[PDB]
């Protein structure tokens, strides 16, 4: 079995707790969560494990070292999240970006460019294409979100299908917080 004693604090860039939970689960089933309104553990599960949920709730409801530790939930978060906070809050690594051809897929178009975007943090990012300065819609749709590398960096990509003409120059336009100016990358039909 797997038991869970899970507390989450919903903080702010400033460092101000805007919410707070403390929850107990067992076997992936959520049993009882703290209620900061009535200052007690209230059963969340009303299925088979409900009876158990009342028993855990009441064992915890009689502990002073606990019922007040969570009555001051909000202010307690800020206290723990203060030395490293602010530090992580403005942690950014700018995104490095490249544009190359890739194997066309899902298109009649003879050429597919891929705009690679990597090493960035935070995860949020915006990619756009321009054909000779003027914007244009991408092959990409359906809400792509950055992949976490699991080491406080993220990566993503975007494609643009096209029919190459001689003068034409195509541009990858990446917008991340890690860079003051929008990153540009170019590509022209060669050979």
């Amino acid at each position: 079995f797997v038991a869970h004693v899970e507390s989450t604090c919903l903080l702010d860039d400033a460092g101000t707790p805007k919410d707070f939970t403390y929850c107990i689960s067992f076997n992936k089933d959520l049993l009882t969560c703290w209620d900061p309104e009535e200052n007690k553990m209230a059963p969340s599960e009303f299925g088979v494990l409900n009876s158990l949920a009342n028993v855990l709730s009441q064992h915890l409801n009689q502990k002073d070292t606990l019922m007040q530790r969570l009555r001051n939930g909000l202010q307690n978060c800020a206290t723990h999240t203060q030395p490293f906070w602010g530090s992580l809050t403005d942690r950014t690594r700018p995104p490095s970006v490249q544009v190359a051809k890739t194997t066309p897929f899902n298109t009649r178009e003879p050429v597919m460019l891929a705009c690679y975007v990597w090493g960035f943090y935070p995860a949020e990012v915006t990619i756009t294409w321009r054909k000779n300065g003027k914007l244009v819609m991408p092959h990409s749709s359906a809400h792509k979100t950055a992949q976490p590398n699991g080491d406080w960096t993220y990566q993503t990509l975007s494609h643009l299908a096209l029919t190459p003409s001689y003068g034409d120059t195509y541009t990858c336009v990446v917008e991340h917080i890690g860079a003051p100016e929008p990153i540009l990358r170019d590509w022209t039909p060669g050979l």
């Binding site: 897929f105 899902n106 298109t107 009649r108 749709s141 359906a142």
Partner: protein, 187 residues
């Protein structure tokens, strides 16, 4: 007990119980179907459109009669279309209608094959074109195939003995994309 041939010829007996929520137009119309099956023969059911248990086969007659006499039970099944069916449809919508995965479309000779793989949900349309002109003759398909992992695939074949200069186009319409996908092949 009877002995012949292969190891383990011992008789098996099997009982299945099924609750089927059938949804029409979101949840505006809902039909619950509660079924009992012994071996391969369904024996008794509760069809929310009928309102009571009914034996399908002889062996189910005792149950239909017995369960219908529990005026209490009937009341709860009659209300299950809401408490169970509609309620459970509520939860999900990661599993329900909302899910959408885009097809991978490729075209390759074999007879031309248009492979449409990895999509969800299973409503799709696959068409063949020769030089802009739709070809409907000589088009067969393996069918829509469920992979068991919440994606489908299908192969749609066009029979032709290709001629040089010809452009063949497979066109795919699926809810996951706003405009049709097209992939071409030439020799």
């Amino acid at each position: 007990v009877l002995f012949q041939g292969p190891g383990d010829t011992r008789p098996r007996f099997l009982w299945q119980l099924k609750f089927e929520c059938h949804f029409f137009n979101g949840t505006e119309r809902v039909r619950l179907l509660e079924r009992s099956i012994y071996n391969q023969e369904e024996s008794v059911r509760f069809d929310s459109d009928v309102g009571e248990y009914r034996a399908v086969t002889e062996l189910g007659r005792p149950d239909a009669e017995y369960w219908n006499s529990q005026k209490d039970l009937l009341e709860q099944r009659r209300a299950a279309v809401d408490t169970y069916c509609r309620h459970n449809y509520g939860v999900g919508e990661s599993f329900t209608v909302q899910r959408r995965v885009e097809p991978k479309v490729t075209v390759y000779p074999s007879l031309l094959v248009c492979s449409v793989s990895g999509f969800y949900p299973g409503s799709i349309e696959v068409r063949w074109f020769r030089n802009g002109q739709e070809e409907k003759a000589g088009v067969v398909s393996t069918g829509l195939i469920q992979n068991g992992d919440w994606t489908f695939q299908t192969l749609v074949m066009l029979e032709t003995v290709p001629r040089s200069g010809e452009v063949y186009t497979c066109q795919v319409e699926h809810p996951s994309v706003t405009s049709p996908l097209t992939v071409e092949w030439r020799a």
